[PDB]
């Protein structure tokens, strides 16, 4: 007569700028986008930390600047744009200053377990980037559709 | 305090992130009219709006 | 014999937004967790894991 069939499909493992583990993490609010837009899976820089008030002004990485933290994916604070999720100018940002997060990567080869993380001028991971960080790799290395993702371990500055 | 010298209203819901208010204008005229007339002036109504956070 | 596990996160603002629009997020995340458990059991059966023998 006929032969029945059964199929299978698996979900993806990660998404850009998504918390990877339940380990000890520290997400800092009270940060503002001073200028421009900040992607969910990119590092940020601290333009200025107000003394009396406490708000820290946050921008995108440029040449010769110290990275601070990675943006965090949220369904409420973030604004959907460019067929993606971004943080708009003049809005609060969830910055993770410690923990394990899924970054955006421009490299092509899997990294070692314990080694320094090098970013480029854009703020995305690159195997031979110029900007130097104190963070270390964690091991995860996957890809969501056509986007490459890498896991990093963040240390407080 | 600013919550005593300025009026406080309550319309927004706790789960809102944006709002919008509108204002309207009037455009028209009138004329002295005799009977057996077909030329009557017309009026209209327009408006604009602004936002908040 | 072996043991399995995962987790998920959510905030108060997301809960309030879900209750205010009829589209919860907690249920979707829980279903994703259960689906992940079932699929990893399938992976163990049909492919196994070398380090765990």
């Amino acid at each position: 007569a006929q032969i029945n069939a059964s199929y299978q499909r698996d979900m993806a493992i990660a998404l850009p700028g998504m918390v990877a583990d339940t380990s000890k993490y520290n997400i800092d609010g009270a940060c503002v986008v001073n200028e421009g837009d900040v992607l969910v899976g990119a590092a940020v820089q601290v333009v200025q930390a107000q003394a009396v008030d406490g708000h820290k002004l946050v921008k995108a990485l440029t040449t010769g600047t110290t990275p601070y933290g990675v943006a965090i994916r949220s369904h409420w604070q973030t604004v959907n744009a460019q067929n993606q999720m971004i943080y708009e100018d003049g809005g609060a940002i969830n910055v993770m200053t410690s923990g394990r997060v899924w970054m955006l990567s421009k490299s092509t080869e899997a990294p070692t377990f314990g080694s320094a993380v090098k970013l480029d001028v854009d703020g995305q991971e690159k195997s031979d980037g110029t900007i130097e960080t104190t963070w270390t790799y964690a091991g995860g290395w996957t890809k969501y559709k056509d986007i490459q993702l890498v896991e990093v371990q963040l240390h407080q500055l | 305090s600013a919550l005593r010298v300025f009026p406080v209203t309550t319309e927004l819901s706790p789960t809102d992130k944006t709002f919008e208010y509108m204002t309207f204008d009037k455009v028209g005229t009138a004329q002295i009219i005799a009977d057996y007339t077909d030329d009557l002036p017309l009026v209209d109504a327009l408006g604009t709006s602004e936002f908040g956070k | 014999v072996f043991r399995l596990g995962n987790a998920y996160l959510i905030s108060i603002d997301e809960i309030k937004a879900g209750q205010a629009t009829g589209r919860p997020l907690s249920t979707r995340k829980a279903s994703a967790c259960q689906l992940a458990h079932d699929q990893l059991v399938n992976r163990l059966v049909f492919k196994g894991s070398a380090p765990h023998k």
Binding site: S6, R9 | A45, L46, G47, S49 | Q39
Partner: peptide
């Protein structure tokens, strides 16, 4: 300028369908 120059917005005349489609992931 001032666009608008109107009384109704695009949101006020709009509909969101009750049906919602979801991607299917078979288990095995």
């Amino acid at each position: 300028a001032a666009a608008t120059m109107g009384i109704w917005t695009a949101q006020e005349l709009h509909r969101i369908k009750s049906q919602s489609y979801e991607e299917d992931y078979p288990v095995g």
